[PDB]
C-alpha cells in the first residue's frame, strides 16, 4: 500500500494538496460521495506527460520531489463536487508506435506515439478531502455499556458511540489493534447539527466482561485528536 | 468515450453463477491485438484492488474464478463460484482511448439463507446526560436480508422521525447486514420519560421483537 497525507476540511474556493508515499506512473483516481470511481489525473514516470480529466484542467497540479520518493496532487478552486476520498495509485502503461509517416526527400518525418493503459495495481489508502465553509471538530465518545439489554444468550454486545465531528472520516480500532474480529463500525450519519455521528459495536462472549478490557480508539486526523475511551459493564 | 456497465445490481446465490458486462462506445481493441480494458473489484471500506488486465488476464492473488472475455467493443467478468467475499462494487476502465474512464460501477449481492437479527439496546451514559444530549442506540446485528423495521415506543406512546438509521456493508465472510437506529434527545426531554423501546420487525422473527429498559434503572 502506499501511504497518503491525512484528511481535511477545506474552505470552498481554497486547494488542497494530497501526498502519495512509497520509477512509475502515478494515477490520481477520486470517489465523490454517493458515486462511482473518477480518473482525475496522472504522471507519466517518464516525467514528459502530466494530464487530467475535463472537468479537472485548469484546476490540478501534479508534482513529484526531488528524491521521487513523494508524488503530489494539487488541486484548485475547490467545490462541493469535489468532496472526495482521493487514491494516488501506481500504473502500467504501453508507449506504443501507432503508424509512421515520412517521405523520401527527408523533411516529413512523422512517427506517432500514444501511451495506453494497461492498469493500476497498488492502491493508497486513500485521503478524505470535505469541502466546507465549517470549522472542524473532534468527536465526543461515550460508552455503549453492555447490560442484560445487549446480551444474547452467552453473547454480549459493547461499544463506543462516536458523535459530533467534523469532518470525515475518524479510525475506529479495538484495544490498539489487537481485537479486530466481530467489529461494526456503521457509516456516519451528518446529524442535525452538521456534525457526523456513529458507533462502533464489538460482539463478545459474555464470561470475558469481567476478564478482558474493551477499550475503543478513536483517530480524526483533521482535528488532530485521539481519544481512547474504557468500556465498563453496567 | 463511456463505458456503459451493466447490470446495476446483481444478486447470486453463493456457489453458482455470477457475470456482468462493460459496454464501450468506441472501440478499446489496439492494432496489437490487446483489448486495453481492466477489472477492478472494490469493498466499500477498503482500497480497490485489481482484478483483470488486458480484457483477459488475471493479476497476481486473484484466484481463477475470476476469468475475463470480450473484445473491442464488448467485456464481460465472471465469477463461477461466489463466495461472500465477492461482496463488492466492480469497476471496468477503458485504457485506449483518452481520456481513460471508469465504469458507473456493478454491485454484488450475495443471497445467503435468511438470518434473524440479534436485538440489543443501549442507555445514553451519564456522562452524555451531563454534557446535556442523551443518545438511545438499538442494535441490529448480523441478519438477512437487508430489508428491516426499526420502530421506537416511549412510554409506550410511538415515535416518527427522531431516529436515525444506520447499515452495514455486506458482510465479506458470512453475508448478513447489520443496522442501528439511533435516537437522540435533549437531557430534559430524555429525562421527561421513563421507558425507551426498539420495535424491530424482520422475516427472520415470525415476531416483532421489543427490546425495552427503564430510564434510571
Known amino acids: 500500500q502506499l501511504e497518503q497525507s491525512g484528511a481535511e476540511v477545506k474552505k470552498p474556493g481554497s486547494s488542497v494538496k494530497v501526498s502519495c508515499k512509497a520509477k512509475y506512473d502515478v494515477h490520481w483516481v477520486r470517489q465523490a460521495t454517493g458515486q462511482g470511481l473518477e480518473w482525475v489525473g496522472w504522471?507519466?514516470?517518464?516525467?514528459?506527460?502530466?494530464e487530467s480529466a475535463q472537468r479537472f484542467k485548469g484546476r490540478v497540479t501534479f508534482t513529484r520531489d526531488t528524491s521521487a520518493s513523494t508524488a503530489y496532487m494539487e488541486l484548485r478552486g475547490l467545490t462541493s463536487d469535489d468532496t472526495a476520498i482521493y487514491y494516488c495509485?501506481?500504473?502500467?502503461?504501453?508507449?506504443?508506435?501507432?503508424?509512421?509517416?515520412?517521405?523520401?526527400?527527408?523533411?516529413?518525418?512523422?512517427?506517432?506515439?500514444?501511451?495506453?493503459?494497461?492498469?493500476?495495481?497498488?492502491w493508497g489508502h486513500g485521503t478524505a478531502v470535505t469541502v466546507s465553509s465549517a470549522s472542524t471538530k473532534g468527536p465526543s465518545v461515550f460508552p455503549l455499556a453492555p447490560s442484560s439489554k445487549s446480551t444474547s444468550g452467552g453473547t454480549a454486545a459493547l461499544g463506543c458511540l462516536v458523535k459530533d465531528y467534523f469532518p470525515e472520516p475518524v479510525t475506529v480500532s479495538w484495544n490498539s489493534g489487537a481485537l479486530t474480529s466481530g467489529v461494526h463500525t456503521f457509516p456516519a450519519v451528518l446529524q442535525s447539527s452538521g456534525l457526523y455521528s456513529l458507533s462502533s459495536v464489538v460482539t463478545v462472549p459474555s464470561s470475558s466482561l469481567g476478564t478482558q478490557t474493551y477499550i475503543c480508539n478513536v483517530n480524526h486526523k483533521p482535528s488532530n485528536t485521539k481519544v481512547d475511551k474504557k468500556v465498563e459493564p453496567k | 468515450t463511456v463505458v456503459t456497465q451493466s447490470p446495476l445490481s446483481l444478486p447470486v446465490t453463493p456457489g453458482e453463477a455470477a457475470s456482468m458486462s462493460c459496454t464501450s462506445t468506441?472501440?478499446?481493441?489496439?492494432?496489437?491485438?490487446?483489448?486495453?480494458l481492466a477489472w477492478y473489484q472494490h469493498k466499500p471500506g477498503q482500497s480497490p484492488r485489481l482484478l483483470i488486465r488486458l480484457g483477459s488476464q488475471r493479476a497476481s492473488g486473484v484466484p481463477d474464478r475470476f476469468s475475463g472475455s470480450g473484445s473491442g467493443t464488448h467485456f464481460t467478468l465472471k465469477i463461477s463460484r461466489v463466495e461472500p467475499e465477492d461482496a463488492a462494487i466492480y469497476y471496468c476502465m477503458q485504457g485506449l482511448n483518452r481520456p481513460w474512464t471508469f465504469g458507473k460501477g456493478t454491485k454484488l449481492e450475495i443471497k445467503r439463507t435468511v438470518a434473524a437479527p440479534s436485538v440489543f439496546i443501549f442507555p445514553p451514559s451519564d456522562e452524555q446526560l451531563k454534557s446535556g444530549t442523551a443518545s438511545v442506540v438499538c442494535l441490529l446485528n448480523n441478519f438477512y436480508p437487508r430489508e428491516a423495521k426499526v420502530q421506537w415506543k416511549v412510554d409506550n406512546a410511538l415515535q416518527s422521525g427522531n431516529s436515525q438509521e444506520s447499515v452495514t456493508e455486506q458482510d465479506s465472510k458470512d453475508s448478513t447486514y447489520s443496522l442501528s437506529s439511533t435516537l437522540t434527545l435533549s437531557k430534559a426531554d430524555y429525562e421527561k420519560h421513563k421507558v425507551y423501546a426498539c420495535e424491530v420487525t424482520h422475516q427472520g422473527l415470525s415476531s416483532p421483537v421489543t427490546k425495552s429498559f427503564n430510564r434510571g434503572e
Open positions: 495509485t501506481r500504473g502500467s502503461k504501453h508507449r506504443l508506435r501507432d503508424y509512421v509517416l515520412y517521405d523520401d526527400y527527408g523533411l516529413i518525418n512523422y512517427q506517432e506515439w500514444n501511451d495506453y493503459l494497461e492498469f493500476l495495481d497498488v
Open positions: 468506441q472501440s478499446l481493441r489496439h492494432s496489437n491485438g490487446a483489448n486495453y
Open positions: 504522471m507519466s514516470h517518464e516525467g514528459d506527460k502530466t
